[PDB]
Amino acid sequence: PALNARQQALLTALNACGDEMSGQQLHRSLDDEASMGLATVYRNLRQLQQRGLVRCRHLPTGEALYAPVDRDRHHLTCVDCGTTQVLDHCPIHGIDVPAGDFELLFHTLEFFGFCSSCRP
Amino acid sequence: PALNARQQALLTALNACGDEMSGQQLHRSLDDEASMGLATVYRNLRQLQQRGLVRCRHLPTGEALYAPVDRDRHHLTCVDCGTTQVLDHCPIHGIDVPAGDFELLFHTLEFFGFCSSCRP
């Protein structure tokens, strides 16, 4: 098929941001011309996800962050204080999973531990 | 300090399930001898997480699932229909983190694509 105007506006906003965006950040980024209700943002994000055009991950707090499917950024996160840093590059280096008759689009990879302040 | 009786009962239940459980599923799994209130389950889970004895991740739905920290099971999930399969083996088994005094506990690795039924 082809993208409706709301799906196109969300993909444009996700591409324009250098980072991931929460549903609320994405909602606040829309100007009058592109404006839609918050529930409409989430519905249209879900459709973009089902078409494999948007990726999602959750912070430890449960907040969802969205990005274009091609943005493959991974983090180290302290399980105590939640402090987080981005990895320089993806350590899988584009290698394929071993290969079950499943068409692969992307991976989320997140590392968890204790920062200097929190380590026992 | 050593693990109290409630912390031990939760670790036992998470080990016995062979996979992961939400806080509500963990609560429903406890036998008469291990049973405690739901708020007690959440408080004790949070403590186990902070001690690095339990790992947590979020499903695409935003539900939080818990497992023993050493249970390292990854999935393929269809972004269209939400069908999921567990991988028999971790494809990044033994990975080190690249580069200042951060103690690694675990990684979350999840693959997303289209299943046989959904692939265009």
Add this chain to the structure above:
Amino acid sequence: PALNARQQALLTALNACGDEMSGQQLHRSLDDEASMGLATVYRNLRQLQQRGLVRCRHLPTGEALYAPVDRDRHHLTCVDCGTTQVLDHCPIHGIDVGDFELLFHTLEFFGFCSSCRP
């Protein structure tokens, strides 16, 4: 006979744990002073099994789980995802079964969980 220090340390650890333990979990759980190589853990477990003091079962993927012989817990296991529930009671309690001396039984159920059933 009587148990050597290594056999006693493994039986103590299996009794102290509220559930079954893999050989690797048992190995990691030992006190520093009683610690031994993983192959030594397996050799000593095999001796405890031969004396009828420890029971063993295998997960579908081949991992061995050990417990005191007296712990008679049975499971429902999904053959797809490996999700498991313990049965609250033994469903063959009181079952009947020359010169074979019976010590214990393993009883394990396999199927599809709600998520995996097509």
Add this chain to the structure above:
Amino acid sequence: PALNARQQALLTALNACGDEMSGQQLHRSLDDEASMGLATVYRNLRQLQQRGLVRCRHLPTGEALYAPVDRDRHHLTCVDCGTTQVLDHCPIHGIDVPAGDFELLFHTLEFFGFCSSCRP
């Protein structure tokens, strides 16, 4: 799904043998027409196991033995010398588990003790 030619060849060989077979025994049983690599045998057995079309049980040594899912044979085994005898019939007589939202396929039932030679 449906069975590929390798899955069909393994099911045929397991049905043709009067009892259970290790992956290596199954591999050695295949004729020129049905032959495949050992790793292919294990991969295809694992798939059949996950689909509930073959049953698996482990000898005390850890060796995996496979059979058609409907073949329900149980044993008496000496824990000392490993000598084993088959039970003349299943004493559960097809009775169902008590009955959560779980579809039951089969049971493994194994008895353990000391043979005449072994009790000290």
